[PDB]
Symmetry: C3
Subunit: 336 residues, 3 copies
């Protein structure tokens, strides 16, 4: 397309919503290509990530860790307004792994506090893709301070299985997994600081050990459990988008499966089926589709079970419906 | 589907065998869906994992680490009697990744010492799958103390390649890989404890470093080497099932390949072919098929070669038969310049 | 083939070139199977691997880390002459993951200083494959001292996609990634040693932490950046071969994609498509094919970004050509 051709396309303004929910969208594209417009404000803020009151200086797209999920269709244009308010202290930018050129947009979006920028790119490849900050010289520090999220580029015709059959989800949830590296003093207590830049040197020391102190979903231990559990019902088709911008993960739904999994995240590669545990490399997003067949509590975990149960990488689904005894039954309940 | 129709099905009681061997089974299912019955008793026991005498309090399904492989076919019912003897000290349960609902069985099978339970589930999805203990609040500690194994759900028509050609193995071995986290004293010497409970706090400290002290096949360093090496012959088709319930691994057969590898472990996903090194993420099982074409010793390793040769994750195959010089030959043996 | 047939095949002697470049070869084979002859000399030498003057005693096929890429076609025979000069101190050998039997050749090629050997094997399976040294009882120590490389066995009809369409590259580069484990003294300074054997105990202690001190491409921090960036032009098709003999990696082209990725490295397994980040397990090689669409500087990284930008695993591509504003454009440049 020429610049004139693009200027004649319809514009659509999208309101973002906080993870794990996803803004409203249509699976099959309603019409031809659009310029889809989003706006995000960056907030630097302290977050508390566990029940011991441990703090991280988060650098958050839209004020959440992860940043929100943006949804477009193949061959739409994504137009982002990115704002770094004067209340912040650091320069920031954005690299979309879905985009082609200029370091995924990082080289065109460097904004100091009090600045804004607008970037547009054509979403030429369908799939789920990571986005993250990447300021020169400080790339990994922004990413492991929570400045990352994902976008989904749906095929215009919606999702399909390997053999061209349509896959239509009832519910979608976005789980962003974050490794954090919090410094400790000589008594093994986590340190606190009064500004992000003050934590920089101590944090780099921990990062170089390659071992996170916490690995969490949606920005904190227990964020998606108990009463902030994701919900579904028996018979509902659910798409679970999962991203990790820095470190590998191996998601598993305890009690379920991934019926179709795009473990690479890319919808032109056919999905793996019937998976117990799938693998998403650091720097990628993946998606799993599952139809719930049994009610009750499911845990959704990174299946390095130390990372899930000791370091924080565990969420719940609460699923309503009737029990199927053909699939599973207690023949003799625990007894003497 | 009905309670009635299920009690009408034939029952077959299987006697389990210790890894790396697998109980007798047929690849192609003979006749219709069955209720296949297994019994395992849980043992808490001290095991020695290296030649230095390092001890771990293991928590072992059927007394072995890994637990034994169970084989059924798709749409069979697996019925497990699980027994926690009153000589044990902890509650245990089982989560089958092959099963659907109730945390894979784990929410229905919590048994204290002196208790037993019977669980039945329909094996709806073909593949190899991990099982493991998962008691609320102590999940990784029972897994990394050895409490895990695998099952294989064969398609009823047996295995096939990506394009419908039948693949029939002559023999099957199950390699369970285990990461252990053994606490050290001030001299760097491994510690010993009286009961499993006593080791808990020090072991969680090592677990949180995410760095195992030992990574082993079949429960110990060198367990599947020497007189305990797996065996085959030139021309023999072997299926190697490998599981890791907690940590990634990257198996490789030194001197061979994986001719067809279901690296995800699931037989409706077509296999990768001609693999050098394949990758099984923590919490999964995979399977590789190979036809041996050369005699001699092979080593089967996790190809982080520090984990293989320093931490324990190496086994041997001894293969009989004739050498093929077309595939490889020494044109000039090591000689002076 | 008969014995006389094998004995009658044409021989071709190939001069190797240092990575990241590759010796001249044809994609589509020209004529029937051949015996392709290569000679490599092993060098044990001290190399400097970062900007701080940190030394390692490298053990280097042909004098380089990684060793060079050898290219043959399926069902050719590769015949290697391997020489261990009298000035080295250790026995060495070679295991080709491409070969069948005798531990990949390792059992037949153990040469002490002052010895040579000639090994021939038939390249029966197409793909990229790791090769590395593996002397009994000292395998990891030779591998993590740099003694590894890769070979490519191309299909006789050249590369194709999943749907049997030909893929022809214009340029090929080989990126070998190396994890090093360099000991430190109690002051945190890296140690130096007179002879390789003097470093053995201290190095195995670091190896057993599973945490590298440096993760590099082509043997050193920054080896493929600046004036040594890899080059291409918009519209050129590049094949990037990447190996890691001991530890996993997750390559990503910042600003691009892998249009076709043989992540397993084996050309009978259909490629994944449209990849953002792909995953190569330790002990394997992989290959990614990309057509460049935008000019500029791209970084090619291991996307554990701590490993890329703190520990050394980052390279650059410099790509010439005209900017395409359809794919990406700055609608509003950073402004107050
Ligand atoms: Cu930032
Ligand atoms: Cu990135
Ligand atoms: Cu248990
Ligand atoms: Cu599990
Ligand atoms: Cu060597
Ligand atoms: Cu190897």
């Amino acid at each position: 397309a020429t610049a004139a051709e693009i200027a004649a396309l319809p514009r659509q303004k999208v309101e973002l919503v906080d993870p794990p929910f996803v803004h409203a969208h249509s699976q099959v594209a309603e019409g031809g290509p659009k310029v889809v417009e989003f706006t995000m404000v960056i907030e630097e803020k302290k977050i508390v990530i566990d029940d011991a009151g441990t703090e991280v200086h988060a650098m958050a797209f839209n004020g959440t860790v992860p940043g929100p999920l943006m949804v477009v269709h193949q061959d739409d244009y994504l137009e982002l307004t990115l704002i770094n308010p004067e209340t912040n202290t650091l320069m920031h930018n954005i690299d979309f792994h879905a985009a082609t050129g200029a370091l995924g947009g990082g080289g065109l979006t460097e904004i100091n506090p009090g600045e804004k920028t607008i970037l547009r790119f054509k979403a030429t490849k369908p799939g789920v893709f990571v986005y993250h900050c990447a300021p020169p010289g400080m790339v990994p520090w922004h990413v492991v301070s929570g400045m990352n999220g994902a976008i989904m580029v749906l095929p215009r015709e919606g999702l399909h299985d390997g053999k061209g059959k349509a896959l239509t989800y009832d519910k979608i949830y976005y789980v962003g997994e974050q490794d954090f590296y919090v410094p400790r003093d000589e008594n093994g207590k986590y340190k606190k600081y009064e500004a992000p830049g003050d934590a920089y040197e101590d944090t780099v020391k921990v990062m170089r050990t390659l071992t996170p102190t916490h690995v969490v979903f949606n920005g904190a231990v227990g964020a998606l459990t108990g009463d902030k559990a994701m919900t579904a019902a028996v018979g509902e088709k659910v798409l679970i988008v999962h991203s990790q911008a820095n470190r590998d993960t191996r998601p598993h739904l305890i009690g379920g499966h991934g019926d179709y999994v795009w473990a690479t995240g890319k919808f032109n590669t056919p999905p793996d089926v019937d998976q117990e545990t799938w693998f998403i490399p650091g720097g990628a997003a993946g998606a799993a589709f599952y139809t719930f067949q049994q009610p009750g509590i499911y845990a959704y975990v990174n299946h390095n079970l130390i990372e899930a149960f000791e370091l924080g990488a565990a969420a719940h689904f609460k699923v309503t419906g009737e029990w199927n005894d053909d699939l599973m039954t207690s023949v003799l309940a625990p007894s003497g």
